[PDB]
Amino acid sequence: MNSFSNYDTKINEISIGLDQVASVMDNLFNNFDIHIQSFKYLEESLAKP
Amino acid sequence: TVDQWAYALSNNPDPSILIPVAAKSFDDLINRRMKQEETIIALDQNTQE
Amino acid sequence: LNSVNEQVHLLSTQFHSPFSQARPSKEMEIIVDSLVEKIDRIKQTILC
Amino acid sequence: IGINESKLLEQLLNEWVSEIENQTKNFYDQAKTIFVWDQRIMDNSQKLGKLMDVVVKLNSQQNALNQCIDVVRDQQALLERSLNALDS
């Protein structure tokens, strides 16, 4: 009984890590379409000439 | 008992995917606490990767 | 009798306390103060 | 501890009853604390899983991006080719 660890620190740290991964993931989707729309404009720019 | 097991089935938060398990000493508690630390270490390692 | 019997028991469950017992243990703090009280009993005997 | 030989059995029984009710309390509060850690670990595990279902979508966006890069490269490599074929 007297040898019971707490673990809420590790379970906070993992939660915060999973919010950092979510924040990077949504940046990654914006950074994906910023490139994909940029390359689409380079195609329409060629299509006429 | 049968009465104790009827309670274990009637308070299960999802009977579709969860099995009820008894603990009856601090040995049973820590035979599950060490598996929370086992799961915490694995859950961090897949979050960091 | 009590304190020897608890360390005899902790070393029988094989239980690594995750809060490791503070170092040195509080009975070693008390053993060193038990040497002081004998030392000062000798000083107060010399002076008598 | 070995029981002290001077103690009354009445004292020893009341001492042990008090300690078993102290241990009964702390067993339920420690087990309740373990149960809160189950949910926090299970919800963080569900959070990680639902992000992995979206890593599969990032891999789809890289294939879409690679296709745009392949198409613009050879639209440019066809424009140079048709300019050389007009110029000549």
Automatic annotation (TrEMBL), chain A:
Domain of life: Eukaryota
Name this polypeptide is given: Uncharacterized protein
Organism placement in taxonomy: Eukaryota, Amoebozoa, Evosea, Eumycetozoa, Dictyostelia
Automatic annotation (TrEMBL), chain D:
Every Nucleoporin NSP1-like C-terminal domain range: 5-88
Coiled coil: none
Localization in the cell: Nucleus, Nuclear pore complex
Family statement drawn from the similarity comment of this UniProt entry: Belongs to the nucleoporin NSP1/NUP62 family.
Name this protein carries in UniProt: Nuclear pore protein
The species this protein was found in: Dictyostelium discoideum
Covered residues, full protein: 521 to 608 of 709
